RNA sequence: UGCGAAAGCAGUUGAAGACAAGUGCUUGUCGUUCGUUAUAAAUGGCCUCGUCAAACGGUGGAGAGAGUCGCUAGGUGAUCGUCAGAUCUGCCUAGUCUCUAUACAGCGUGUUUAAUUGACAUGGGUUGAUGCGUA
């Protein structure tokens, strides 16, 4: 019927010019998706590091939430959006350590990252089989 | 739960009546109305000195005092704030007796003196209630008469309980309806209990019962939430209203050691099923539902401390766990000085969490059945072992194994009878005393395999064994409840590769990840650096132990040059792990014209 | 015997940011019409009565839009200078308007030609003119003179009461329901002043400090009043005279605010708030005023309005922009001889002793893949999985059902390269998704173990494997990364 | 059931019967009724017969009769599967029957694991008896001794079709645990879905947890929420404990793994669904199926017994209390607190009573002679039951042999007071008692392998009147 | 088969008797016994009671579809070619941007936490089956 399916890993209820920090802070505060999307369109890693560097630690946490939801809904953005996530953890790591709760607020990341990794053993099994057949007819 | 230090409210005057410390409490009366959880004021009647009101916080101070002649003793005193014909007023009602010849009932009205009235009481006034709503003052007399007066002390109604020599009268309210009960001694240790309802007559008797075996001379009585508490000869008797029926008797051994006559005891309730008990200068907070001592405090600077009254929390409804109680403290010295003191009390959460392991009350395997189906003397052992000569291994092993009929040098399910802990501890003590140096008996090897190895001997157990190689691997593998700190110190101090893997396997198996992470934070930075170098030179349990290390070290501590070497090793391992996994999966996994030679 | 169970559609564990019942209602305002006006549309109001036409004030004219037609039906252009209000009375018969000259004009709604009453409220601009909700005769006016006069329709020569005490422009006026004597006004002082008309008046009974210029004050309920000013809106309780909640989710300064209750939405009550940042967002008063939906427009929003509770037809959401654009979003709502011969169908047995019902309710028609599985057509059911215009979720179920039935090889025996490519084509795209990755691994494994020889002699099948090996290899990188970010995320905690 | 019309060789069908048709017969002077015997081959432990009397006119069940349908851990007595075209898990081939019979007799005699214990539940609000049949629950009324419902609680090929030949090797989801909240308005079910064989994903079992609701008047449980892979991937839920009335007014539960992890779920009104409120990390690398869980009535403390070690964890912090740890001689089978003061802990070699107030064991009774390797981990828990007022019961079953073990069994019930000081009663029953549990009244119900639920508890007118009735 | 965790760790799958077929010999079988913890395949697949249209209430979504040479990051091809690059004003993938009946899937609206109505004579006969539409 209309029951909700869920999982046990859902811990929800438990330097340089060109930086877009000004736009990013406004977009996150007002939850303006369109304004946020333009910020995420920048792909120059030098820009990404600097913007997160100047971004206020309080706003960094909600940025991680926004990226996690975008990555979970769209798998094709998993690559380009990860560098945002990786830089957020590197720069604001000290702030993230000193937070009363992480699982409830970062529940979206834990679920999304957990899902992909659980497929890892199966994909290796498929890859080995595909190599076995790919090797066979290539030599023949 | 906890007990705060007492802080002084006032110094009692040096009056002859108050000089008798055993009877000192009876001469000081506490107003019920002014003393509760939310009131910052306390009204007190000191016999022969005055009736005083004090403010408790921020600092104790005297706010009002009414002098009384020194020959008078205050038998009952109450104070309540209310509106009287409308002005906000504070009504003070107190009764005195003068050499037993005349008895005075007095009401004083103060503006928040507006009026003062005085009448002659028939018998000693024991309990006084002020009903500010109806503008009434109700007095209970020792001769059984309950007299209702106005604020002008005009008699409105008089009710007789048909019993004299009344000894106990306490007030309580239930569901907004006002009730009172009283206890009247009878002969042959009998006691008439009557419950009265206050509403043509304003007093209605609801129950009347006679209680047998209820003595007063050595009984301390107090009431809380429909239950009556009677301490007698170290036993607390539980009577439940409205019939005052005995429910429970609680044994308190700490009072059974008290010689009769010298030990000063007071009793008061502080919350639901929680009371305050005092023995001379020691204060006990007790939970009677679970029979546990929540807290204990000794007042070394005072000879005795007697509880007078306590502000009681209704913990079932109140989120506040902090309250206050009042008592009289008597100092040590040739000229003892009595002082009134206040103690702040944390009752707790009224949960079994609070009472666990704090009981104030101080084995042999038994066949399940007393008596054609398919089957699937410790002290003497200790005495024999102790009598041996020192360093006599063969005899010590012979007596232990033969007499207990043990066959193996390691514990088996058939040795369940030997699991008595006291016997094992004594044997361990003998093994330590009887043997030292490099030679220990085979009994130690058996004990190391015993699941109930005492926790007391686990500490330094590895340290005692640092001589003999074989005794480690028995201890590491099987010895129970070995401390984590010692294992971690041995983990980073030992170079033997085999012990490292076994120690790593033991640590992870028996300890949680978070518990291990905290300890490694204590370990020196050089030791962890040495461990990391060991790596760069079953493996997952060693690597998973490494991943715990990097978490303990943190970002700040780790050094870049070593990080480069560690990174290269891991990348090589990841490539190898990827390579092996591919192998593992592999293990699991007509022409139109043809030219042929015919076989003929 | 039991009826055949229906094939259950596969539902993976919930992902973040699911659609909420509140969102599903507000997405239905789909049809959008963008009208251009001469100047900024300062105020928008809805007729309280059927058909609930709404009036928009822009430049020097007031226009009434038909609800059903969504087009102008009346025009009030008699005003010489700028207009500043078009509020209807509770009866909906009259609409009042203020003017920069300060004159207040009362026209008969739907009859622009006739002017019933003309009041010269002040020499300064009269920005707010609102009819009293409970009492029909008295009309309230607030002007830049900073005095909010209470006029009476019968006596237009002198104000009935002249409230004062505001040290700045008063541009907000509100009447509290169930409290006809009370009147609430908010000035750019940052103070919300409440007045009692029963008493002598002219001095507020008390003031509530908002700390920013107040742009609009609305009384959501008899005891709760919500005021929007500066960059946030705060809800005050009069009985306690303190702010219960405050939401500053907006970026620019909130300008307009409207409240609708007891309408057919899942949310009993809604609070729409303009932002001046292009955003108009919905808040739920039942849930501590939490955001539940939002729209974005081209430019700053000055006025927002929603159809009253008893709209009785298609609902409307209206947004007013400073550029002069008006955005409208709408949620749309034989022979007698033969009959005498056949006249018993209408009867439902109301007068009979025993009523007997055995008709089985109609089940929804089953899809082609379900019918094939029910008839044990394993191979055909596989074909129906890979057909053009087939839902991705529905394709996963038939693959999961066939596996659950134990028919994976059974469906794959009688196949060649011509009929194998549709499965491989889906596998090429299905491997990417997390939900279908596990199912793709099993099915791809079987076809390889079952068609190794055919793969050698078929070049087209090989190429499907080369690109597939590329894609699975790409998934390995994504899954490996997710382990690394997971690994470092453990370091932080 | 197929009606072959022999005149034209046609046929009519009555499919989706509850079980395979052992026997079929036409019962009536005019063939009014059809009598059928159904087998329910899903339960391998026992042969579950159901007698179905159908009305031939419309082929509707005129009368369906069956007794209790428990699922024992292992096959009992001389139960043998029916004959099929192939030898499968649910059937026997032509050749395999005799060898299977011999193997079964040899297993019952020679082997030492003789566990037939079955899981059963009691509905508090209604006192109906819930039997977790494989992939379904049979709701049975023991006051009336009649079945009241049979509901499918899992996905799978359960009544979509009739499995034949290789399809008969498929394993439907198994309902391992089934429990009720103290209030009785919520049902918690734990399921294991077995993948089909000969695939890449043929070794990865799926663990599911489900929360169902129904009003008292209704008779069918409605699934409200579904958790796929609780506690992680391929990690079972060994133990389930519904919460006491004190915490969340009985709308919570704990699930415990074989890795030592605990998860506390509760019903959140705002979300309207069950969500994971609290979590404990099963990070350490120790595995054991011997997990037991108890909760104090107040709700302050929770007793978690993993392998040989018992822990007292506070509910508020969901961690060890700040002695909390208790070591035991062998693995813990069941932990139960008869009263808040007394905690009764059963290990594989003995049973003990301990005072939490004193932290000292009062009484210890030997169990090794009777329970050495007879039962698998956790089943002694469904053997031992406790009242919340009077006391607990120990059930001990023995094979009877005269001059090598024989099939027949004898069961002994022992009533124990709180702390096990005295044996209030001692009774003997003549059959293997699979499960004994405490009805919410004082009486205790117990189930026999013979499917028998016993209870242990405290003139001219007169002549004309006769003749007229005769006529 | 035993133990265990689910991963796995150890250990098995023998002898006799009878029958059929082929040529005393060979193989295969067992509604035969003793002992040990111990491929399939007789063309053979699941009933009927009422359908269709339009709504409404929750539950999910990879959204169902069409544009925009508007941006961002990639992959890559035809021909020529002074290897720098040209014409195809190249193609494809992903994100972003614009739009629509949320357009997509599913359960229910016999009473439920919530949520429905309307149409049909549920028949018989004739023609077309080279049906009808589309390239």
Swiss-Prot record, chain A:
Name of the protein: U3 small nucleolar RNA-associated protein 5
Subcellular location(s) per record: Nucleus, Nucleolus
Subunit structure: Interacts with snoRNA U3. Interacts with MPP10. Component of the ribosomal small subunit (SSU) processome composed of at least 40 protein subunits and snoRNA U3. In the absence of snoRNA3, forms a complex with other t-UTPs. This complex can associate with pre-18S ribosomal RNAs.
Family, similarity comment: Belongs to the UTP5 family.
Additional free-text comment from the UniProt record: Present with 33100 molecules/cell in log phase SD medium.
Role description: Involved in nucleolar processing of pre-18S ribosomal RNA. Required for optimal pre-ribosomal RNA transcription by RNA polymerase I together with a subset of U3 proteins required for transcription (t-UTPs).
WD repeats: 54-94
Name of the gene this protein is made from: UTP5
Curated annotation (Swiss-Prot), chain B:
Entry keywords, A to Z: Nucleus, Phosphoprotein, Ribonucleoprotein, Ribosome biogenesis, rRNA processing, Transcription
A GO term from the CC aspect: t-UTP complex
GO BP: maturation of SSU-rRNA; maturation of SSU-rRNA from tricistronic rRNA transcript (SSU-rRNA, 5.8S rRNA, LSU-rRNA); positive regulation of transcription by RNA polymerase I; tRNA export from nucleus
DNA-binding among keywords: no
One Pfam family cited in the UniProt record for this chain: Utp8_C
Molecular function in Gene Ontology: tRNA binding; U3 snoRNA binding
Compartmental location: Nucleus, Nucleolus
Record's function text: Involved in nucleolar processing of pre-18S ribosomal RNA. Also has a role in nuclear tRNA export. It acts between the steps of tRNA maturation/aminoacylation and its subsequent translocation out of the nucleus. Required for optimal pre-ribosomal RNA transcription by RNA polymerase I together with a subset of U3 proteins required for transcription (t-UTPs).
Subunit structure, interactors included: Interacts with snoRNA U3. Interacts with MPP10 and UTP25. Component of the ribosomal small subunit (SSU) processome composed of at least 40 protein subunits and snoRNA U3. In the absence of snoRNA3, forms a complex with other t-UTPs. This complex can associate with pre-18S ribosomal RNAs.
Miscellaneous: Present with 16800 molecules/cell in log phase SD medium.
This protein's name: U3 small nucleolar RNA-associated protein 8
Organism, scientific name: Saccharomyces cerevisiae (strain ATCC 204508 / S288c)
UniProtKB/Swiss-Prot annotation, chain C:
Keyword Repeat set for record: yes
GO cellular component assignments: 90S preribosome; nucleolus; nucleoplasm; rDNA heterochromatin; small-subunit processome; t-UTP complex
Keyword rRNA processing recorded: yes
Domain of life: Eukaryota
Primary localization: nucleus
Subcellular location: Nucleus, Nucleolus
Record key words, sorted: Nucleus, Repeat, Ribonucleoprotein, Ribosome biogenesis, rRNA processing, Transcription, WD repeat
Ranges for the WD repeats: 36-77, 78-117, 123-161, 165-205, 209-246, 249-293
Disulphide connectivity of cysteines: none
Swiss-Prot/TrEMBL GO biological process terms: maturation of SSU-rRNA; maturation of SSU-rRNA from tricistronic rRNA transcript (SSU-rRNA, 5.8S rRNA, LSU-rRNA); positive regulation of transcription by RNA polymerase I; rRNA processing
Molecular-function GO terms, alphabetical: U3 snoRNA binding
Subunit structure: Interacts with snoRNA U3. Interacts with MPP10. Component of the ribosomal small subunit (SSU) processome composed of at least 40 protein subunits and snoRNA U3. In the absence of snoRNA3, forms a complex with other t-UTPs. This complex can associate with pre-18S ribosomal RNAs.
PANTHER family in the cross-refs: U3 SMALL NUCLEOLAR RNA-ASSOCIATED PROTEIN 15 HOMOLOG, UTP15 U3 SMALL NUCLEOLAR RNA-ASSOCIATED PROTEIN 15 FAMILY MEMBER
Function: Involved in nucleolar processing of pre-18S ribosomal RNA. Required for optimal pre-ribosomal RNA transcription by RNA polymerase I together with a subset of U3 proteins required for transcription (t-UTPs).
Additional notes on this entry: Present with 358 molecules/cell in log phase SD medium.
UniProt name for this protein: U3 small nucleolar RNA-associated protein 15
Gene that this sequence comes from: UTP15
From Swiss-Prot, chain D:
Membrane-spanning ranges: none
WD repeats: 170-222, 232-275, 285-322
Tagged with keyword Phosphoprotein: no
Top-level taxon of origin: Eukaryota
Keywords, comma-separated and alphabetical: Nucleus, Repeat, Ribonucleoprotein, Ribosome biogenesis, rRNA processing, Transcription, WD repeat
Gene Ontology MF: a single term: U3 snoRNA binding
Cellular localisation: Nucleus, Nucleolus
Disulfide bonds: none
GO biological process entries: maturation of SSU-rRNA; maturation of SSU-rRNA from tricistronic rRNA transcript (SSU-rRNA, 5.8S rRNA, LSU-rRNA); positive regulation of rRNA processing; positive regulation of transcription by RNA polymerase I
GO cellular component: 90S preribosome; nucleolus; nucleoplasm; peroxisome; rDNA heterochromatin; small-subunit processome; t-UTP complex
Purpose of the protein: Involved in nucleolar processing of pre-18S ribosomal RNA. Required for optimal pre-ribosomal RNA transcription by RNA polymerase I together with a subset of U3 proteins required for transcription (t-UTPs).
Assembly information from the UniProt record: Interacts with snoRNA U3. Interacts with MPP10. Component of the ribosomal small subunit (SSU) processome composed of at least 40 protein subunits and snoRNA U3. In the absence of snoRNA3, forms a complex with other t-UTPs. This complex can associate with pre-18S ribosomal RNAs.
Miscellaneous section: Present with 6560 molecules/cell in log phase SD medium.
Protein name: NET1-associated nuclear protein 1
Species whose genome carries this gene: Saccharomyces cerevisiae (strain ATCC 204508 / S288c) (Baker's yeast)
Source species taxonomy: Eukaryota, Fungi, Dikarya, Ascomycota, Saccharomycotina
Protein encoded by which gene: NAN1
Complete-protein stretch covered: 321 to 829 of 896
């Amino acid at each position: 019927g209309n029951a909700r399916v869920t999982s046990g890993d859902n811990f929800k209820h438990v330097t340089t010019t060109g930086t877009v920090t000004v736009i990013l802070s406004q977009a996150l505060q007002s939850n303006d998706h369109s304004l946020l999307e333009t910020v995420l369109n920048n792909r120059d890693e030098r820009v990404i590091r600097d913007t997160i560097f100047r971004l206020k630690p309080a706003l960094a946490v909600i940025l991680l939430e926004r990226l996690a939801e975008r990555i979970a809904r769209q798998t094709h953005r998993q690559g380009p959006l990860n560098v945002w996530v990786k830089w957020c953890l590197i720069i604001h790591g000290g702030y993230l350590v000193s937070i009363p709760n992480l699982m409830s607020t970062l529940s979206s990341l834990h679920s999304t990252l957990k899902r992909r990794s659980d497929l890892l053993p199966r994909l290796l099994a498929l890859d080995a089989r595909l190599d076995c057949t790919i090797n066979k007819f290539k030599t023949l | 739960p906890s007990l705060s230090q007492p802080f002084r409210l006032a110094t009692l005057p040096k009056i002859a009546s108050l000089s008798n410390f055993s009877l000192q409490a009876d001469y000081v009366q506490v107003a019920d109305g002014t003393f509760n959880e939310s009131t910052n004021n306390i009204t007190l009647g000191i016999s022969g000195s005055s009736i005083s009101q004090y403010i408790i916080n921020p600092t104790p101070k005297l706010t009002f005092d009414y002098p009384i002649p020194s020959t008078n003793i205050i038998t009952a005193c109450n104070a309540e704030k209310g509106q009287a014909n409308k002005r906000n007023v504070e009504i003070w009602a107190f009764g005195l007796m003068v050499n037993k010849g005349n008895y005075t009932l007095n009401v004083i009205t103060k503006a928040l003196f507006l009026s003062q009235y005085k009448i002659k009481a028939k018998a000693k006034v024991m309990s006084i209630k002020i009903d500010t709503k109806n503008s009434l003052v109700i007095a209970i007399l020792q001769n059984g008469l309950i007299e209702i007066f106005d604020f002008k002390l005009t008699l409105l109604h008089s009710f007789d309980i048909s019993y004299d020599n009344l000894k106990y009268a306490k007030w309580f309210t239930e569901n907004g309806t006002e009730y009172v009960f009283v206890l009247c001694p009878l002969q042959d240790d009998k006691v008439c209990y009557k419950l009265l309802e206050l509403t043509s007559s304003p007093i209605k008797e609801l129950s009347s019962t006679i209680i047998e075996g209820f003595s007063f001379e050595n009984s301390k009585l107090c009431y809380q939430f429909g239950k009556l508490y009677k301490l007698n000869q170290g036993k607390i008797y539980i009577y439940s209203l409205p019939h005052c029926q005995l429910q429970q008797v609680i044994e308190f051994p700490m009072v059974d050691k008290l010689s009769p006559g010298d030990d000063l005891i007071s009793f008061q309730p502080v919350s639901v099923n929680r009371v305050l008990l005092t023995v001379n200068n020691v204060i006990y907070l007790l939970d009677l539902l679970h029979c546990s001592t929540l807290s204990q405090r000794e007042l070394t600077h005072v000879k005795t401390f007697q509880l007078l009254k306590s502000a009681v929390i209704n913990s079932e409804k109140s989120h506040n766990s902090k309250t206050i109680a009042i008592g009289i403290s008597t100092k040590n010295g040739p000229n003892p000085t009595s002082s009134l003191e206040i103690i702040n009390i944390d009752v707790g959460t009224n949960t079994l969490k609070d009472s666990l392991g704090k009981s104030f009350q101080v084995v042999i395997l038994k066949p399940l059945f007393d008596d054609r189906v398919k089957c699937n003397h410790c002290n003497e052992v200790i005495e024999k072992l102790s009598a041996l000569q020192d360093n006599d291994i063969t005899s010590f092993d012979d007596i232990f194994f033969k007499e207990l009929k043990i066959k193996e040098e390691h514990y088996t399910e058939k040795d369940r009878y030997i699991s008595d802990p006291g016997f094992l501890n004594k044997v361990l003590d003998l093994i330590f005393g009887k043997f030292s140096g490099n030679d220990y008996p085979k009994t130690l090897t058996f004990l190391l395999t015993h699941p109930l190895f005492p926790l007391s001997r686990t500490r330094n157990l590895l340290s005692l064994l640092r001589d003999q190689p074989r005794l480690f691997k028995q201890a590491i593998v099987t010895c129970p409840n070995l401390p984590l700190n010692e294992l971690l110190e041995e983990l980073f101090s030992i170079r033997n590769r085999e012990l490292l893997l076994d120690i790593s396997f033991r640590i992870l198996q028996d300890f949680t990840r978070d518990s291990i992470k905290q300890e490694m934070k204590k370990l020196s930075k050089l030791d962890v650096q040495n461990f990391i170098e060991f790596i760069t030179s079953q493996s997952t349990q060693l690597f998973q132990l490494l991943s715990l290390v990097l978490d303990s070290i943190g970002l700040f501590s780790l050094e870049g040059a070593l990080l480069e070497n560690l990174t290269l090793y891991i990348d090589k391992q990841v490539e190898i792990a990827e390579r092996n996994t591919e192998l593992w999966n592999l293990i699991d996994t007509l022409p139109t014209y043809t030219m042929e030679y015919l076989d003929i | 015997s039991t009826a055949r169970p229906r094939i259950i559609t596969s539902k993976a564990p919930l992902l973040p940011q699911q659609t909420t019942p509140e969102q599903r209602y507000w997405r239905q305002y789909t049809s959008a019409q963008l009208v251009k006006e001469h100047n900024s549309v300062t105020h928008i109001s809805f007729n309280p009565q059927h058909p609930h036409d709404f009036a928009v004030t822009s430049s020097t004219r007031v226009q009434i839009f038909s609800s059903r037609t969504r087009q102008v039906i009346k025009t009030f252009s008699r005003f010489k200078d700028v207009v500043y209000s078009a509020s209807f009375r509770s009866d909906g018969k009259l609409l009042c308007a203020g003017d920069a000259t300060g004159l207040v004009s009362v026209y008969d709604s739907y009859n622009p030609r006739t002017i019933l009453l003309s009041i010269n409220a002040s020499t300064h601009p009269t920005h707010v003119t609102k009819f009293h909700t409970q009492d029909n005769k008295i009309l309230a006016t607030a002007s830049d003179d900073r005095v909010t006069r209470l006029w009476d329709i019968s006596n237009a020569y002198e104000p009935q009461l002249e409230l004062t005490g505001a040290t700045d422009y008063v541009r907000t006026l509100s009447f509290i329901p169930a409290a006809p004597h009370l009147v609430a006004t908010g000035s750019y002082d940052g103070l919300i002043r409440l007045y009692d008309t029963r008493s002598s008046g002219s001095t507020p009974i008390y003031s509530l400090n908002h700390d920013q210029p107040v742009e609009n004050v609305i009384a959501v309920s008899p005891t709760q009043i919500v005021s929007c000013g500066g960059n946030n809106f705060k809800v005050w309780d009069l009985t306690s005279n303190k702010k219960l909640y405050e939401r500053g989710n907006f970026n620019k300064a909130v300008t307009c605010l409207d409240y609708v209750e007891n309408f057919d939405s899942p949310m009993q009550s809604a609070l729409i708030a303009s932002s001046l940042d292009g955003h108009v967002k919905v808040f739920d008063p039942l849930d501590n005023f939490q955001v539940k939906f939002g729209w974005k427009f081209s430019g700053p929003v000055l006025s927002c309005a929603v159809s009253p509770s008893t709209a009785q037809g298609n609902r409307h959401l209206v947004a007013g922009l400073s550029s002069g654009l008006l955005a409208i979003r709408t949620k749309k709502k034989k022979s007698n001889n033969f009959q005498r011969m056949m006249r018993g169908s209408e009867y439902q047995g109301d007068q009979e002793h025993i009523i007997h019902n055995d008709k089985v309710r109609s089940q929804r028609r089953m899809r082609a893949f379900e019918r094939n599985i029910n008839q044990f057509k394993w191979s055909e059911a596989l074909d129906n999985a890979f057909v053009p215009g087939m839902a991705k979720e529905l394709t996963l179920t038939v693959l999961q059902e066939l596996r659950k039935r134990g028919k994976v090889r059974v469906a794959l025996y009688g196949r060649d390269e011509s009929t194998l490519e549709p499965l491989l084509n889906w596998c090429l795209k299905g491997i990417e998704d997390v939900r279908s990755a596990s199912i793709v691994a099993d099915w791809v494994a079987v076809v390889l173990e079952l068609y190794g020889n055919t793969l050698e002699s078929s070049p087209v099948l090989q190429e499907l494997m080369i690109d597939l090996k590329t894609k699975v290899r790409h998934e390995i990188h994504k899954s490996k990364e997710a382990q690394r970010i997971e690994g470092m995320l453990q370091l932080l905690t | 059931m197929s009606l072959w019309q022999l005149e034209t060789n046609s046929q009519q069908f009555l499919p989706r019967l509850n079980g395979i048709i052992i026997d079929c017969q036409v019962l009536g002077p005019q063939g009014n009724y059809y009598s059928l015997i159904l087998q329910m081959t899903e339960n391998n432990s026992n042969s579950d017969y159901q007698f179905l009397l159908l009305n031939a006119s419309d082929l509707t069940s005129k009368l369906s009769i069956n007794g209790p349908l428990p699922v024992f851990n292992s096959t009992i007595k001389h139960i043998q599967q029916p004959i099929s075209a192939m030898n499968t898990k649910n059937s026997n081939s032509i050749t395999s029957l005799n060898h299977s019979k011999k193997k079964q007799s040899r297993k019952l005699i020679k082997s030492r694991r003789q566990d037939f214990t079955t899981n059963v539940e009691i509905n508090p609000i209604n006192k109906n008896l819930y039997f977790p049949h494989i992939s379904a629950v049979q709701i049975f009324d023991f006051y009336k001794n009649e079945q009241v419902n049979y509901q499918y609680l899992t996905s799978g090929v359960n009544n979509s079709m009739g499995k034949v030949r290789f399809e008969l090797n498929l394993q439907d989801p198994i309902i391992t645990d089934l429990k009720f909240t103290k209030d009785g308005q919520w049902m918690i079910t734990y399921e294991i879905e077995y993948p089909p064989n000969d695939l890449l994903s043929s070794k990865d079992l799926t663990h599911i947890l489900k929360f169902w609701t129904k009003n008292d008047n209704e008779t069918n449980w409605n699934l409200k929420t579904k958790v796929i892979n609780p506690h992680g991937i391929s990690v079972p839920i060994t133990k389930i404990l519904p919460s006491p009335r004190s915490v969340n007014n009985s709308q919570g539960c704990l699930t415990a793994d074989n890795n030592g992890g605990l998860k506390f779920w509760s019903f959140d009104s705002h979300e309207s669904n069950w969500c994971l409120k609290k979590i404990s990390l099963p990070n350490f690398n120790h595995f054991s199926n011997s997990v037991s869980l108890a909760w104090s009535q107040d709700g302050s403390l929770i007793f978690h017994g993993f392998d040989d070690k018992l822990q007292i964890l506070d509910f508020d912090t969901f961690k060890k209390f700040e002695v909390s740890e208790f070591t035991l001689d062998s693995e813990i089978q069941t932990v139960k607190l008869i009263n808040d003061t007394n905690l009764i802990v059963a290990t594989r070699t003995t049973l003990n009573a301990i005072n939490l107030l004193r932290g000292q064991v009062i009484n210890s009774f030997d169990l090794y002679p009777f329970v050495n390797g007879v039962y698998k981990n956790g089943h002694m828990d469904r053997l031992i039951t406790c009242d919340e007022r009077t006391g607990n019961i120990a059930l001990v079953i023995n094979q009877q042999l005269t001059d090598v073990p024989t099939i027949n069994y004898k069961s002994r019930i022992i009533i124990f007071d709180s702390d096990l000081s005295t044996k209030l009663g001692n009774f003997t029953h003549h059959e293997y008692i699979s499960w004994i549990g405490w009805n919410y009244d004082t009486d205790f119900i117990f189930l026999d392998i013979e499917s028998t639920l016993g209870v242990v508890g405290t003139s001219n007118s007169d002549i004309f009147a006769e003749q007229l009735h005769k006529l």
